[PDB]
Amino acid sequence: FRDTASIGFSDTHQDEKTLRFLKKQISQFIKHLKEYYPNNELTKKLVMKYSDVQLLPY
Amino acid sequence: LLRGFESSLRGSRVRTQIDDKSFIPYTWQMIDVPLAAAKTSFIAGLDTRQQLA
Amino acid sequence: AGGLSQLVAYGAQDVYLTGNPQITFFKTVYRRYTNFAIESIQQTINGSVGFGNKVSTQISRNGDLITDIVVEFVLTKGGNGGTTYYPAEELLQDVELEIGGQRIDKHYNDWFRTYDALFRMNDDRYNYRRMTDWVNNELVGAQKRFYVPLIFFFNQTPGLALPLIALQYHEVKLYFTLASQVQGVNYNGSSAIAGAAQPTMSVWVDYIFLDTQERTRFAQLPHEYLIEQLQFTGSETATPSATTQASQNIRLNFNHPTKYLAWNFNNPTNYGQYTALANIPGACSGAGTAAATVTTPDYGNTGTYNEQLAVLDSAKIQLNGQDRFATRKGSYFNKVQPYQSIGGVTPAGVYLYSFALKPAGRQPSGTCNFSRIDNATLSLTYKTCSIDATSPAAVLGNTETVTANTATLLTALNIYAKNYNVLRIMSGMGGLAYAN
Amino acid sequence: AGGLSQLVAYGAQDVYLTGNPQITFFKTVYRRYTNFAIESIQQTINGSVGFGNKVSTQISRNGDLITDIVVEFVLTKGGNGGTTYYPAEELLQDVELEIGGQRIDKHYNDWFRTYDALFRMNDDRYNYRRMTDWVNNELVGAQKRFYVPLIFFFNQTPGLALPLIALQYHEVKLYFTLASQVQGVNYNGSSAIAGAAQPTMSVWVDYIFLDTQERTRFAQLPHEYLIEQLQFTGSETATPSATTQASQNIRLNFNHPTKYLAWNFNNPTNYGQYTALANIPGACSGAGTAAATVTTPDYGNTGTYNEQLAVLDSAKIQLNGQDRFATRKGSYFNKVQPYQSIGGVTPAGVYLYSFALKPAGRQPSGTCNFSRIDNATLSLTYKTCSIDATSPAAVLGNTETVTANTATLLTALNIYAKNYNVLRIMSGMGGLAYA
Amino acid sequence: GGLSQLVAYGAQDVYLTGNPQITFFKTVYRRYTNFAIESIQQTINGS
Amino acid sequence: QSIGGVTPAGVYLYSFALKPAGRQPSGTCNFSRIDNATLSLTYKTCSIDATSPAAVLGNTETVTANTATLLTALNIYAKNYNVLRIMSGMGGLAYA
Amino acid sequence: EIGGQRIDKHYNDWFRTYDALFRMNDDRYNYRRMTDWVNNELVGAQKR
Amino acid sequence: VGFGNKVSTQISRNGDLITDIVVEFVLTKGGNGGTTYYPAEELLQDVEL
Amino acid sequence: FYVPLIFFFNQTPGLALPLIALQYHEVKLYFTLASQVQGVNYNGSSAIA
């Protein structure tokens, strides 16, 4: 019937976590004044900020 | 000295720095003494209302 | 002495209770569960809200499952306390549940009232009235927001939450009819209330958000939900009469394994009026005095437990020509049936006959499959309407087989049946296992 | 004919219900259980009992496990019927539970009232009222014994019975704070009642005595009990006004997996007053007559279901900057939330928001873990206090968004949260898994 | 929204949702022995 | 307990340190790890008629002067430790 | 009580009955001296 | 508790070590200024550890 | 009023009693209150009504 592809809930690709998320980033990188890590490795931080998927077959 | 100083930013004041760790190792006292337990037939008795002879 | 004196008192008759023990009571094993959260989301109402108007809303695919639905209505009083009776219930004339274009179920304002009369109770019932009426002696001009919970199968238990996530191709919609008139709000008996406001309406749906593993399974796997459906038809009541005992045989166009039947007689003029009116306290406008009128109810007290004002003398159900059970009195169906099977208190004029041990529950517990019945008939015998409603001596001192002369106004009959079907969900679409 | 006519009515459609049957309704299965006995034993209360005093007791080791605890009080009416409202509940200002020196939990007189308002019901609630108040139109000088059951996690089910037997090295103590004053007993509003008696007090603990096998099992094994805790802070309610709708963002100092939040607004002077006073029937002392005065409640009728006298217009809970749900009216939190989640009736001025499917049970059913939330904010909007409370027409005939001028007296706000934690009992000692 | 609660998962929740055993959103009802109930009048012996 | 001096009425102290008056750290509360450090204050009832010395001098613990309502400002202080790092001719603080 | 188990219990009346039957002579008198005022003490007198 | 009474306390195991101990008392003057001398000190007749 | 105790462990943290190392022994304080306190319940030899 009504070709509705996705559920209308933000859980698509929104990061609705707390600010502890930033602390989690400090876990994958150096855990100190790490500001130079995102100030320089924008590519590494972007790849570290991608979403996951789980396909559904009809 | 002017830019590499660590500031008390967000993430360091999270509640999980206290709630995730239990207060059991900071308040409990070491025992190393076994606990007792006894049968119910030892404190109550033997119930003398059994047979007669 | 003390508790040890009971423990020591042990012998052969204790073995059947505590020998070779299987359980304890002093440590509960709790079961770890999945990760989920619940959120209330406003739906958009298409159409136009107003009395007599129809509206509809699509339940948005906001959550990976839906349960509770509450419809808000804002109404004002068109008169003083005593003029309204569950007006938000009267207002929600009906609601249709549709999935993928096909009706799954449909409820009527009268069903909500009938259902309530039989299945809600105690503080659950009182709190329930507080959400649909004015119960603190409010006066004309008062404004209140009412909350009408829906009672579709998924609105009663998480166990049947509808997997919107598994319905990638089907929308689920709610269609609503708002009554042309609501007593004590925009009309008083048959009279319109000048200046009455139109309702403000909003539909709220409580959504369940699942975590990754649970959501994935719901999205991919086929499901079979055991669901409830309401069957309903309106009939004319063999009009009760002062001169005799009316009788009637109503063939029931029902199918499916039915949990129970329920019915009521009513005066369609006044929402919720299932009994006759009389000059006794609460039984009519002005009851108890010279000015009492037994043709207009005390709306705030429209319902009653005084069976003397009800019209059913007796009834039975016949299946394929044979009596299902021996004929029983109307009070059996009003008081005993729900005593034995529900445990609540049912207002006079409302009747129940269960085929189920526990008709109020989700789990099947005995059903009557009307699909194997060629001729399903409800047989009714009415009371004689010989009692002068304006005279308490006659109203209250009378016999089992008679009722009020005003009971002849209870000309409508509403017969309901609740049955079990299966809602199949797969490949993004829902469907019913059984048509009939 | 008869029931046989239904059994024969069997088709393909009945297979999902009765084909290849799994169960039978006509045969009940009970399980054999351990052998145990229950005894109610009086505890010794340390400190002097009286108004405003703080007293305590250590639970004795008479049995192996404990559940129910009932505090007995004897109070004497300081005036006639209608001057008191749940006075034994008001008297017990609070109770702390400490095991081995660690605070496990705490309940407050207001909490007992809020808890009751949300979770007790029907005749459970009435019988409760009978144990804490005078409900048969008693007169001055009447003396009654009141019973206040406690509401700690082990006081609700044997399932969480506290294993005193496995707490071999730890004492369990209860600290009870008695109110400085109880309305209609030792004070009438702010005025002391001459001749008022001090309360008699006694604490009773219901003990479970185990048999040989279970008693041994408990003493020798470590145990972990999933229990509830109450979090609570008091705060000022942005005072509403006749001309503006006060608003307030309240930061919630809560942690752990919370089943629900609960709150109320109140007049701190009048125990149990969660709504404004008014000249409508029972909403003020003297309501309905010339003497009606909207400065004092009809205490025996302090509560009401008339939301018109409640202060809250609307509310939402915002978590980490995002609405946790759409803003709803105060009446939602008063009537629908408990309709859906509890099934009882909540009086006006008391609100509930559940994060759980069934918060009234013991089995967790969805929680909000505030230890993973940085900004937990309760956002409240209040009604305008423009209604002349001394005129029932003004009250009874008003609009959704307005309330009594006397609603500005509801300046206290009590916000509660009920959550889970784990009580670990090991090597004879008790304590909590999560700080 | 509700999603902000789901991601708020911690150590404290291991006893509630870790290694999950049950759900609340899939009730499977039991199939049961077919039966019918009839109310039948008895004969009472004696005045 | 913590200083050994005598503090004027209206001035309050709460130490997290054994000896806060000294230089050597002797216990501290690190508020950089506390989300909600809240100071809860309950005030006395200003029922005493300040113009009548008997009213003041003979009164109870929970009350004060009617003139006490003039004390409308609240000043809250905290004293902490930090590190002033000095290197290669320059200085600055280790923590902000 | 020993270990939570009641072993025994005495009552004021028992002490009186017990004494009446089993104490005697000067033991009984000395007992009375330790529990009563037997030297014509007057109002306001204090005794351990 | 009151004048002439003997009371006692058992220190609970709330923490690990104990140091300073303060006994609080609430007293009311039975006469005017100049009629007392360190009365809370006088009140606590003795303390045994 | 506040009456700090003057036992050795109440004077220096250096002598803090290790309740933690006293697992099977209790620490108790027995306090005797005076029958009379000057200017509070007695004035010289007279009681204060």
Side-chain angles (χ1 to χ4, degrees), chain G residues 9-23 28 31 35:
Chain G
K9 183 171 185 168
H10 293 296
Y11 300 85
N12 57 3
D13 190 71
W14 178 240
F15 280 93
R16 177 64 180 86
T17 297
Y18 172 79
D19 187 73
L21 294 173
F22 295 94
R23 293 199 181 87
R28 176 176 286 172
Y31 175 81
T35 62

Side-chain angles (χ1 to χ4, degrees), chain D residues 103-423:
Chain D
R103 177 179 289 166
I104 304 302
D105 205 356
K106 185 171 188 168
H107 295 273
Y108 305 85
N109 58 1
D110 189 72
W111 177 242
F112 279 92
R113 177 64 180 86
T114 298
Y115 173 78
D116 186 72
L118 295 174
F119 294 93
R120 294 198 181 87
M121 60 186 76
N122 304 329
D123 289 343
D124 183 67
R125 176 175 287 173
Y126 178 65
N127 192 61
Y128 176 79
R129 186 176 184 179
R130 291 176 71 207
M131 292 188 290
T132 61
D133 206 349
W134 288 270
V135 298
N136 303 280
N137 198 27
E138 292 88 342
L139 302 174
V140 65
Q143 183 186 51
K144 296 287 182 289
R145 185 174 298 268
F146 296 97
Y147 300 88
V148 180
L150 302 181
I151 55 172
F152 290 101
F153 69 89
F154 60 87
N155 298 135
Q156 298 295 295
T157 179
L160 299 175
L162 188 69
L164 293 176
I165 188 167
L167 294 169
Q168 293 261 319
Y169 181 76
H170 282 176
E171 71 278 21
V172 179
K173 291 179 175 172
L174 298 173
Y175 296 86
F176 307 91
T177 301
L178 305 175
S180 64
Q181 62 187 60
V182 177
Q183 169 64 42
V185 178
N186 65 329
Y187 288 92
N188 186 35
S190 67
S191 296
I193 298 171
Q198 298 299 306
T200 297
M201 181 181 173
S202 178
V203 178
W204 291 83
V205 178
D206 295 350
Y207 289 85
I208 298 100
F209 298 82
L210 300 173
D211 65 11
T212 59
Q213 182 65 340
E214 191 168 25
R215 179 182 299 180
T216 301
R217 184 185 70 81
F218 270 100
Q220 74 185 26
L221 301 179
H223 306 275
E224 298 189 352
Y225 292 92
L226 180 62
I227 63 167
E228 300 181 4
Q229 296 181 296
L230 181 69
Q231 298 176 57
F232 170 72
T233 63
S235 68
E236 185 178 4
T237 300
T239 301
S241 174
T243 60
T244 64
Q245 292 189 258
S247 64
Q248 186 179 16
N249 294 306
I250 301 171
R251 189 173 186 86
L252 306 177
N253 299 327
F254 296 138
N255 59 359
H256 301 306
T258 296
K259 289 193 284 179
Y260 63 90
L261 303 182
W263 63 96
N264 68 64
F265 302 88
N266 66 76
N267 181 333
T269 299
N270 299 321
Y271 179 75
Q273 183 182 342
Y274 302 113
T275 63
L277 301 172
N279 190 13
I280 65 170
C284 67
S285 176
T289 190
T293 301
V294 298
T295 65
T296 301
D298 181 357
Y299 287 104
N301 295 297
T302 299
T304 186
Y305 298 103
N306 189 358
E307 188 64 14
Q308 289 173 318
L309 298 177
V311 74
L312 187 66
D313 180 3
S314 69
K316 66 178 184 178
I317 300 167
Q318 184 181 25
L319 305 175
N320 302 318
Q322 299 295 323
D323 291 351
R324 173 57 182 74
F325 59 92
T327 304
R328 305 296 292 277
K329 306 298 288 186
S331 65
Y332 171 76
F333 294 99
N334 181 250
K335 296 176 182 177
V336 175
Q337 283 282 309
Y339 173 79
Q340 292 177 336
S341 65
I342 299 173
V345 62
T346 300
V350 178
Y351 303 100
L352 169 68
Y353 183 78
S354 177
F355 301 107
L357 294 170
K358 186 176 179 179
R362 299 283 83 77
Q363 167 69 58
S365 57
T367 58
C368 180
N369 187 346
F370 285 103
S371 297
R372 293 289 182 274
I373 298 169
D374 294 327
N375 301 313
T377 299
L378 178 65
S379 295
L380 304 174
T381 300
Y382 302 103
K383 293 182 177 181
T384 57
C385 300
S386 64
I387 300 299
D388 183 351
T390 64
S391 177
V395 175
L396 293 172
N398 68 47
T399 63
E400 181 177 47
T401 59
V402 300
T403 190
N405 64 300
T406 56
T408 63
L409 298 173
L410 300 173
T411 63
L413 166 61
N414 292 335
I415 303 167
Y416 300 93
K418 197 80 188 291
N419 65 280
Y420 287 97
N421 205 320
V422 177
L423 178 63

Side-chain angles (χ1 to χ4, degrees), chain C residues 43-320:
Chain C
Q43 307 299 305
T44 296
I45 299 169
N46 291 316
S48 178
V49 304
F51 292 108
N53 294 327
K54 295 187 182 184
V55 301
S56 67
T57 186
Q58 184 184 100
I59 299 169
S60 295
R61 288 212 315 165
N62 324 248
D64 310 358
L65 291 161
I66 58 171
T67 57
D68 298 79
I69 300 178
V70 179
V71 180
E72 292 179 5
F73 299 97
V74 182
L75 301 173
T76 61
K77 295 186 80 60
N80 292 321
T83 62
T84 59
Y85 188 71
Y86 296 91
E89 298 182 359
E90 185 177 7
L91 179 60
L92 193 158
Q93 180 180 316
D94 62 43
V95 57
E96 303 188 7
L97 176 66
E98 183 183 87
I99 300 175
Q102 171 65 51
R103 182 178 294 167
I104 303 301
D105 202 357
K106 183 171 186 170
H107 299 166
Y108 302 84
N109 57 6
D110 192 71
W111 175 238
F112 280 91
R113 177 64 180 86
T114 298
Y115 175 81
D116 188 70
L118 296 173
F119 296 95
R120 293 201 179 86
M121 61 184 77
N122 305 335
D123 288 350
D124 180 4
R125 176 174 286 169
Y126 177 68
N127 189 61
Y128 175 90
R129 185 173 185 180
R130 292 174 69 209
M131 292 189 290
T132 62
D133 205 352
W134 286 264
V135 297
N136 303 281
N137 299 315
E138 292 89 342
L139 302 173
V140 65
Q143 183 183 50
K144 300 285 275 190
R145 183 177 299 268
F146 295 119
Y147 300 90
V148 180
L150 302 182
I151 56 172
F152 292 115
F153 67 89
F154 64 91
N155 299 137
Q156 295 188 44
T157 182
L160 299 176
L162 187 69
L164 295 176
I165 191 66
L167 296 171
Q168 294 86 338
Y169 299 117
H170 284 178
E171 74 280 26
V172 54
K173 296 172 77 178
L174 302 171
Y175 294 84
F176 298 89
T177 302
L178 279 71
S180 65
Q181 62 183 60
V182 178
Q183 171 65 45
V185 177
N186 66 332
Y187 295 91
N188 187 26
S190 68
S191 296
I193 300 172
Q198 293 295 313
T200 298
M201 178 181 167
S202 179
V203 178
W204 292 93
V205 179
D206 286 316
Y207 288 84
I208 297 159
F209 303 88
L210 300 172
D211 199 354
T212 299
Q213 291 180 356
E214 183 178 1
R215 184 185 301 155
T216 298
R217 288 194 297 273
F218 276 101
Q220 186 173 44
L221 299 176
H223 304 278
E224 295 185 359
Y225 289 90
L226 180 66
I227 64 165
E228 299 180 0
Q229 296 180 298
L230 181 68
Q231 297 176 65
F232 169 72
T233 63
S235 298
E236 295 287 325
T237 300
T239 301
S241 174
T243 62
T244 190
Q245 293 192 257
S247 64
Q248 190 173 16
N249 294 290
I250 302 170
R251 188 173 178 278
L252 306 176
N253 297 317
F254 294 147
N255 290 282
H256 300 278
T258 296
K259 183 169 71 172
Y260 64 88
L261 303 181
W263 63 94
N264 68 63
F265 300 90
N266 67 75
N267 181 340
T269 302
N270 300 313
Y271 178 75
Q273 184 183 341
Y274 302 116
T275 65
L277 306 179
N279 190 15
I280 63 172
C284 68
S285 174
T289 189
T293 170
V294 300
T295 60
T296 299
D298 182 356
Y299 286 102
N301 294 295
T302 299
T304 187
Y305 297 102
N306 187 1
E307 71 187 272
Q308 290 174 316
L309 299 175
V311 298
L312 183 65
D313 181 22
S314 71
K316 64 176 181 177
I317 300 169
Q318 183 183 33
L319 301 176
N320 293 329

